[PDB]
Design an enzyme around this catalytic site. Structure first.
Site, short mmCIF file in Angstrom:
data_model
loop_
_atom_site.label_atom_id
_atom_site.label_comp_id
_atom_site.label_asym_id
_atom_site.label_seq_id
_atom_site.Cartn_x
_atom_site.Cartn_y
_atom_site.Cartn_z
N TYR A 59 7.95 8.19 2.89
CA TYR A 59 6.58 8.66 3.04
C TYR A 59 6.51 10.17 2.87
O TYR A 59 7.46 10.89 3.24
CB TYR A 59 6.06 8.33 4.46
CG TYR A 59 5.97 6.83 4.70
CD1 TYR A 59 4.97 6.07 4.13
CD2 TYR A 59 6.90 6.22 5.53
CE1 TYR A 59 4.87 4.69 4.35
CE2 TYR A 59 6.83 4.84 5.74
CZ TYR A 59 5.84 4.11 5.16
OH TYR A 59 5.79 2.75 5.40
N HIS B 198 -1.78 -2.74 8.62
CA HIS B 198 -1.25 -4.09 8.44
C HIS B 198 -1.66 -5.05 9.57
O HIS B 198 -1.56 -6.27 9.39
CB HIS B 198 0.28 -4.08 8.46
CG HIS B 198 0.91 -3.45 7.25
ND1 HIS B 198 0.60 -3.82 5.96
CD2 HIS B 198 1.86 -2.49 7.17
CE1 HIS B 198 1.33 -3.10 5.12
NE2 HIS B 198 2.10 -2.30 5.83
N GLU C 158 -0.16 7.26 0.83
CA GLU C 158 -0.29 6.80 2.22
C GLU C 158 0.76 7.48 3.10
O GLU C 158 1.84 7.86 2.65
CB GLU C 158 -0.07 5.31 2.33
CG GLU C 158 1.12 4.74 1.67
CD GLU C 158 1.31 3.25 2.00
OE1 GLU C 158 1.51 2.97 3.20
OE2 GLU C 158 1.25 2.42 1.09
N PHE D 105 -3.07 -5.07 3.68
CA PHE D 105 -3.81 -4.16 4.55
C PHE D 105 -5.26 -4.60 4.76
O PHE D 105 -5.87 -5.24 3.90
CB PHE D 105 -3.88 -2.78 3.85
CG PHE D 105 -2.59 -2.00 3.94
CD1 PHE D 105 -2.21 -1.36 5.10
CD2 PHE D 105 -1.82 -1.84 2.80
CE1 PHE D 105 -1.04 -0.63 5.22
CE2 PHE D 105 -0.68 -1.11 2.91
CZ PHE D 105 -0.24 -0.49 4.06
N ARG E 37 -1.93 3.45 8.65
CA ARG E 37 -1.69 4.51 7.64
C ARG E 37 -2.97 5.32 7.41
O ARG E 37 -4.08 4.78 7.49
CB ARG E 37 -1.40 3.87 6.27
CG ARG E 37 -0.24 2.88 6.25
CD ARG E 37 1.12 3.59 6.40
NE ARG E 37 2.16 2.54 6.34
CZ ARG E 37 2.75 1.98 7.38
NH1 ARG E 37 2.48 2.34 8.63
NH2 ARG E 37 3.65 1.02 7.15
N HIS F 184 4.01 8.14 0.09
CA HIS F 184 4.25 7.60 -1.25
C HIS F 184 2.97 7.01 -1.79
O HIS F 184 1.99 6.87 -1.06
CB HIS F 184 5.35 6.54 -1.27
CG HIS F 184 5.00 5.31 -0.50
ND1 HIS F 184 5.64 4.98 0.67
CD2 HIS F 184 4.10 4.32 -0.74
CE1 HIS F 184 5.14 3.84 1.13
NE2 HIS F 184 4.21 3.43 0.29
N1 LIG Z 1 -0.34 -4.05 0.55
C1 LIG Z 1 -0.08 -2.92 -0.19
N2 LIG Z 1 1.14 -2.39 -0.06
C2 LIG Z 1 1.29 -1.31 -0.86
C3 LIG Z 1 0.34 -0.77 -1.70
N3 LIG Z 1 0.85 0.35 -2.30
C4 LIG Z 1 2.02 0.39 -1.88
N4 LIG Z 1 2.37 -0.50 -0.98
C5 LIG Z 1 3.70 -0.69 -0.24
O1 LIG Z 1 4.34 -1.87 -0.71
C6 LIG Z 1 4.98 -2.44 0.45
C7 LIG Z 1 5.01 -3.82 -0.25
O2 LIG Z 1 3.68 -4.36 -0.36
C8 LIG Z 1 3.73 -2.47 1.40
O3 LIG Z 1 4.11 -3.20 2.62
C9 LIG Z 1 3.32 -1.01 1.27
O4 LIG Z 1 4.23 -0.14 1.95
P1 LIG Z 1 4.04 0.42 3.39
O5 LIG Z 1 4.56 -0.63 4.33
O6 LIG Z 1 4.90 1.63 3.31
O7 LIG Z 1 2.61 0.68 3.59
C10 LIG Z 1 -0.93 -1.40 -1.75
O8 LIG Z 1 -1.89 -1.00 -2.44
N5 LIG Z 1 -1.08 -2.48 -0.95
#
Ligand SMILES: Nc1nc2c(ncn2[C@@H]2O[C@H](CO)[C@@H](O)[C@H]2OP(=O)(O)O)c(=O)[nH]1
Ligand SMILES: [Ca+2]
Length: 104
Positions: free
Chosen positions: A38, A92, A58, A100, A77, A40
């Site tokens: 992070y 989440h 995020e 999300f 986030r 990212h």
């Molecule tokens: N659900 C979701 N995950 C994302 C997205 N962009 C990046 N990610 C990262 O991809 C991981 C796989 O989906 C997610 O759990 C999330 O990481 P974070 O847990 O760091 O938020 C997005 O637009 N949606």
């Protein structure tokens, strides 16, 4: 009352600005923290109707009120863009898998 409610976690505006400022600074510096690196990019797979432009990044916001420095980032986030504008606060908690939902 909370400015954002993420599940059971209650955040004020100042909580969000504080987390956002830390995340934006690392983003500008080209630096990351934590095993998931992070801040990212946030791809917006969920299709949220944010009122500011992409690209979005995020960064974890933590219920302890500490700034994220590594370790578990928990569920919540802040999402900011290249101009350091806040796009939203998302979580989440209450969503299936690694999806999300927005904090309310
Ligand atoms: N659900 C979701 N995950 C994302 C997205 N962009 C990046 N990610 C990262 O991809 C991981 C796989 O989906 C997610 O759990 C999330 O990481 P974070 O847990 O760091 O938020 C997005 O637009 N949606
Ligand atoms: Ca607080």
């Amino acid at each position: 009352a909370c400015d954002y409610t993420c599940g059971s976690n209650c955040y004020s505006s100042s909580d969000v600005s504080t987390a956002q400022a830390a995340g934006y600074k690392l983003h500008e510096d080209g630096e990351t923290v934590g095993s998931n690196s992070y801040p990212h990019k946030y791809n917006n797979y969920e299709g949220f109707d944010f009122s500011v432009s992409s690209p979005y990044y995020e960064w974890p916001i933590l219920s302890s009120g500490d700034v994220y420095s590594g370790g578990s980032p928990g569920a919540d986030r802040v999402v900011f863009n290249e101009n350091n504008q806040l796009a939203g606060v998302i979580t989440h908690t209450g969503a299936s898998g690694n999806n999300f939902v927005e904090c309310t």
